[PDB]
């Protein structure tokens, strides 16, 4: 079996810079080598095959090149909408098999969180639980550290943290921090408070509710 | 137009077995053979076998029927390794080699003894906004399994939307929010509404989310 | 236009392993599709002996096997035995000029170490019923000789004769050696207007002469 | 078993038409993809024509592009070619051939058939005459006499020679017929058998050419 391996699970550039993925085999496939786009919750999309020949509708700035064991995959002027994965495959010989895919992420200017925090929802509450939701909106980049404090409290292991992919226009992440508790035990207290520090922060920023006003 | 349209999201238990489905629309099925993949977060893209028209050993069993223009996969006795995203293609024209062009939605194979559960929708109301921007959401709680969909105002509101991936929860159950951001100066001149498809539980929800 | 070049010829002893390379181009086997191998015997079909690069049908020996790298393919046989003897020829598809089933040019596949045969040579005068016809060939046979590289000559009395003469080309009978096929054509003034008439086969630079007179 | 069988091959003036055809059994014609490949006299294999199990494609190779149909019945299990404007050069065995199943990366031809010549040439089919070759000695085993036949001038290829009606096997030998300048082939075939038997037994050898509708039937009797 043909190994396919591409030595950068990550890969970084700008908008309008030139990027350059590397893919070797290890075995002589001449230029039976095909790669493909994959963005978040899509199928693959194919790019390129037989190493340099541009599938239909492909952007002209999707080029490949290479022979024998070294693909190189190109992108002349990257733009916004080029976050992806990208796969390559021999199609030499059987079984069909794919290199490990390399991350596209993009640069750009650092940008400061938007901080929401929602209290749980009287329809929740009836529920007999109590989500607490604080929301980090358009920022870069994806480091980020959320704090949650109740009755200045600091609590630990109670939150949960999901983060979006980042977005296909402004290149920003957006991320979400979850405090659940018992409703009986949401209604003992009377702050509820989450603090975000971000590299475009200044200071940390505090967003906070008294349970009742 | 070539189109392959794949069979929904499955929940298989351990030692169980699922068959899993393609149905092909736009071509003589019996001009192309199809081919079968497995995606997982660990193993990457991994190429299964082909379905020939006119009919991972012991794994997979692969069939196909012209009568429906469909082609087949049976998973057998399933495992935690079986869980994945599944998919099937085509190659883009009869002479090609095996690149693939023409892929399906793909269908995700859950394997797990848990009970399947429809969420309950809570709204995450606005209140009194980073200056200019208001925030507003939907709170998709304790489904099982994946996936769940989420558009808002049955499609028409785009701009501003952040569908955050699931959590898995310490009861083995998923949450997740879908936020929307807009203008201040929107908050009280349109409604606002989450739609919600959780197919595995037959679940529809539209969810009103007023300030 | 393209086709998938092979050596015309491949030798090896009983016992040895040998190859067959089958070089293509970046428009069929260097771009991945697939080479395939057959076997011709002298008057049979052309029979499948590798698909799928590698794979042996059922009732191939495994002393066959495929592979290939780059634009090239190759087909080794180790243990070569004297019934490999025979044609072969890679096969791949080309997609350059809309797309076609190419060939391999061929490779005559010969076990060396065959044991040298003198011929058995027969001679036929014209029969009786011909001279009636108004023509007259004598038939010269060769057979059952190793090699193939034999030599006739034919004399009237003591002299060669000028033309009239055909020759075939030798080929391998079913005991593996070879036979040929040489004719005189004479008028019947000349068949019983000379002595004598002579065939000289030489083979090996052994020469056997068979006289026949009217 | 899987069979193939192709006829129809023969003779043909330069631009005339020819009309091959392969019978199939053994196996689902309509499943697989059929095939046309011919093989030059002592020449390499060359790609002729490909339809589909469906007749829904159809590829030609360059060189009989306008010229040939290719063509498929499936409820008759036949395939057909449709040969027009021949030309000298397309002289060849046709072979019809089954493509075999692959996962992409182009098929093999799996199953071949045993052949049908065409022979485009403006020469005319010509009858052998067939001549006696009397019994001789002098070249064969003790005890045993050599006895031929010898065809002469027919055209085109091939002839068929057996002996005693095909009751007599063992001492046969047909040699391949020569090519004379002329165009015409000439073949000999003897036989040895017991000089013992050379009083009371009869040796016919019988020549088929059934190119041109010839049967002879010749007698050989010692000198």
């Known amino acids: 079996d043909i190994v396919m391996t591409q030595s950068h699970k990550f890969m970084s550039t700008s908008v309008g810079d030139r990027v350059s993925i590397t893919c070797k085999a290890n075995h002589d496939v001449n230029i039976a080598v095909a790669w493909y786009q994959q963005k978040p919750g899509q199928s693959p999309k194919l790019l390129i095959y037989s190493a340099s020949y541009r599938y239909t509708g492909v952007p002209d700035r999707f080029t490949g090149s290479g022979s024998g064991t070294d693909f190189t995959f190109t992108i002349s002027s990257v733009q916004a909408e080029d976050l992806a994965v990208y796969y390559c495959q021999q199609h030499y010989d059987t079984p069909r098999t794919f290199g490990g895919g390399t991350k596209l992420e993009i640069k750009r200017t650092v940008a400061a969180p938007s901080v929401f925090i929602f209290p749980p929802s009287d329809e929740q509450l009836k529920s007999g639980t109590a989500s607490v939701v604080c929301l980090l909106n358009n920022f870069y980049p994806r480091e980020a550290k959320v704090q949650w404090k109740v009755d200045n409290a600091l609590q630990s292991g109670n939150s949960q943290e999901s983060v979006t992919e980042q977005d296909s226009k402004d290149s920003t992440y957006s991320l979400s921090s979850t405090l659940t508790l018992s409703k009986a035990d949401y209604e003992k207290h009377k702050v509820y408070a989450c603090e975000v520090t971000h590299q475009g922060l200044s200071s940390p920023v505090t967003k906070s509710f008294n349970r009742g006003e | 137009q070539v189109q392959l349209q794949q069979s929904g999201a499955e929940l298989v238990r351990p030692g169980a077995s699922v068959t899993l489905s393609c149905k092909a629309s736009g071509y003589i099925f019996t001009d192309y053979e199809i081919h079968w993949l497995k995606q997982t977060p660990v193993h990457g893209l991994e190429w299964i076998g082909t379905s020939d028209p006119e009919t991972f050993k012991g794994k997979a069993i692969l069939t196909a029927d012209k009568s429906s223009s469909t082609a087949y996969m049976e998973l057998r006795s399933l495992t935690s390794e079986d869980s994945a995203v599944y998919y099937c293609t085509r190659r883009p024209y009869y002479g090609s080699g095996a690149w693939f062009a023409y892929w399906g939605q793909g269908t995700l194979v859950t394997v797990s003894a848990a009970s399947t559960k429809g969420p309950s929708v809570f709204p995450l109301a606005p209140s009194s906004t980073s200056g200019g921007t208001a925030a507003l959401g939907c709170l998709v709680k304790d489904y099982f399994p994946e996936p769940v969909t989420v558009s808002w105002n049955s499609g028409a509101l785009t701009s501003g939307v952040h569908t955050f991936p699931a959590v898995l929860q310490s009861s083995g159950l998923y949450s997740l929010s879908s936020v929307v951001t807009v203008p201040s100066s929107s908050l009280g001149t349109q409604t606002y509404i989450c739609n919600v498809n959780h197919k595995p539980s037959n679940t529809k929800v539209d969810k009103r989310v007023e300030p | 236009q393209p086709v998938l070049t092979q050596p015309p010829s491949v030798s090896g002893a009983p016992g040895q392993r040998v190859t067959i390379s089958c070089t293509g181009s970046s428009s069929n086997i260097g771009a991945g599709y697939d080479v395939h191998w057959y076997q011709q015997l002298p008057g049979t079909a052309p029979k499948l002996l590798i698909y799928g690069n590698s794979n042996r049908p059922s009732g191939v020996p495994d002393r066959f096997s495929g592979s290939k790298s780059g634009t090239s393919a190759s087909l080794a046989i180790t243990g070569l035995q004297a019934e490999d003897e025979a044609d072969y020829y890679c096969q791949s598809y080309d997609s350059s000029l809309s797309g076609f089933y190419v060939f391999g040019t061929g490779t005559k596949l010969t076990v060396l170490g065959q044991p040298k045969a003198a011929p058995s040579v027969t001679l036929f005068p014209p029969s009786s019923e011909e001279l009636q016809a108004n023509k007259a060939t004598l038939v010269c046979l060769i057979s059952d000789f190793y090699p193939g590289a034999v030599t006739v000559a034919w004399k009237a009395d003591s002299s060669p004769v000028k033309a009239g003469v055909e020759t075939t080309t030798p080929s391998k009978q079913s005991n593996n050696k070879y036979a040929a096929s040489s004719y005189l054509s004479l008028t019947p003034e000349q068949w019983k207007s000379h002595r004598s008439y002579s065939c000289q086969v030489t083979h090996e630079g052994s020469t056997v002469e068979k006289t026949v007179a009217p | 078993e899987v069979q193939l069988v192709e006829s129809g091959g023969g003779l043909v003036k330069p631009g005339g038409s020819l009309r091959l055809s392969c019978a199939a059994s053994?196996?689902?014609?309509?499943?697989?993809?059929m095939n046309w490949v011919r093989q030059a006299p002592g020449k390499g294999l060359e790609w002729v024509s490909s339809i589909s199990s469906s007749s829904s494609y159809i590829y030609y190779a360059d060189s009989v592009k306008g010229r040939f149909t290719i063509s498929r019945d499936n409820a008759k299990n036949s395939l057909y070619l449709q040969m027009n404007s021949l030309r000298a050069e397309d002289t060849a065995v046709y072979y019809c051939?089954?493509?075999?199943?692959?996962?992409?990366?182009?098929?093999?031809?799996?199953?071949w058939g045993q052949g049908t010549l065409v022979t485009v040439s403006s020469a005319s089919t010509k009858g052998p005459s067939v001549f006696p070759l009397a019994p001789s000695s002098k070249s064969t085993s003790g005890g045993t006499a050599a006895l031929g036949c010898l065809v002469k001038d027919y055209f085109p290829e091939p002839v068929t020679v057996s002996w005693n009606s095909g009751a007599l096997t063992s001492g046969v030998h047909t040699f391949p017929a020569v090519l004379q300048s002329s165009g015409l082939y000439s073949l000999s075939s003897v036989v040895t058998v017991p000089s013992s038997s050379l009083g009371t037994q009869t040796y016919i050898c019988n020549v088929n050419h059934k190119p041109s509708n010839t049967k002879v039937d010749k007698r050989v009797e010692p000198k």
């Open positions: 053994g196996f689902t014609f309509s499943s697989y993809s």
């Open positions: 051939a089954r493509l075999g199943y692959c996962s992409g990366g182009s098929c093999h031809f799996d199953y």
